[PDB]
Design a protein around this ligand. Structure first.
Ligand SMILES: [Cl-]
Length: 310
């Protein structure tokens, strides 16, 4: 019935803001094209995972993806800017950066490496968890193995507090925590609960120590070939979906914290720790110390532009 089909691939649960956003995109394309185009969304790495999605887009075997910033850092080193610990003060700060000058500079870089860069999507600020002991101060992280996404900034960040970071694809994280391959991880609350990382960690600290978000991209050769008269509807669909995703993400921390809290009370197998300002300061000092290592590959003046956004 559909004359054309589009394959979206991502690594998260459909129950997250990002997953709901992809499904909303898919639904709106269908409606706006009166059934001529059908978008099929493969979540949870069903079609391609962290390690395979990029090439897939290059070759046109997948059409649309929404990778986290860290996932771009081998193609575009500067995207590591958004991984720096404590770089974003809050969501107001974030969105002024993402929908402003710096956001555009990084889109443009991705565009040059052969992807069609569209909009930024939100996950949330990241939190430390462990199976070994409570993480209250930098001191506690020392000697522990942590999963990270593939980013030199994140491996520097954990090295700075004496931990052992290890890159693993998102789809392997639950099993790796369950089997002791790593002691802990850092996640936004959205991924922490929807992937059941809560069921395989004994301690969660609301550290808010770094940010995780996404850049929607499309396959350049898919887009080159896609029919000119149907492109406007795809683009409108995505615009609407971006607005919708960010609304779902605003709700998300409160909803997820309630669910994680109920799980901890009912199961007795998770303690949730909040930090004192004293504790927060110490995290900021230890983790920001890494910034100068990255003036060369990210750009000192780029980091300063972000810090200056009021
Ligand atoms: Cl909250």
């Amino acid at each position: 019935m559909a004359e054309y089909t589009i394959k979206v691939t991502h690594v998260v649960s459909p129950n997250t803001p990002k997953g709901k956003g992809a499904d909303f995109f898919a639904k709106r394309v269908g409606e706006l094209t009166n059934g001529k185009v059908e978008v099929i969304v493969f979540p949870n790495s069903q079609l391609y995972g962290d390690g395979e999605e990029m090439k897939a887009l290059k070759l046109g075997n997948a059409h649309i993806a929404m990778p986290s910033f860290s996932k771009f850092t081998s193609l575009v080193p500067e995207m590591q800017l958004f991984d720096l610990p404590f770089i974003f003060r809050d969501k107001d700060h974030l969105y002024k950066v993402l929908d402003g000058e710096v956001g555009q500079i990084l889109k443009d870089k991705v565009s040059k490496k052969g992807f069609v860069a569209l909009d930024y999507w939100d996950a949330g600020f990241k939190h430390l968890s462990s199976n070994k002991k409570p993480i209250l101060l930098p001191e506690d992280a020392a000697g522990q193995k942590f999963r990270i996404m593939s980013s030199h900034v994140l491996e520097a960040q954990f090295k700075a507090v004496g931990a052992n970071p290890q890159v693993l694809p998102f789809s392997e994280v639950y099993s790796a925590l369950q089997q002791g391959v790593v002691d802990g991880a850092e996640n936004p609350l959205s991924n922490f609960y929807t992937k059941k990382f809560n069921e395989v960690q004994t301690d969660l600290t609301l550290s808010n120590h770094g940010y995780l978000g996404y850049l929607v991209i499309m396959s350049e050769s898919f887009w080159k070939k896609f029919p000119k008269d149907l492109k406007p509807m795809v683009l409108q669909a995505m615009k609407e979906a971006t607005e919708y995703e960010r609304k779902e993400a605003a709700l998300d921390d409160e909803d997820m914290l309630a669910k994680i809290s109920e799980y901890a009370k009912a199961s007795g197998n998770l303690k949730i720790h909040t930090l004192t300002p004293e504790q927060k300061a110490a995290w900021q000092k230890a983790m920001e110390a890494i910034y100068p290592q990255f003036y060369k590959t990210i750009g000192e003046d780029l980091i300063k532009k972000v810090q200056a956004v009021k």
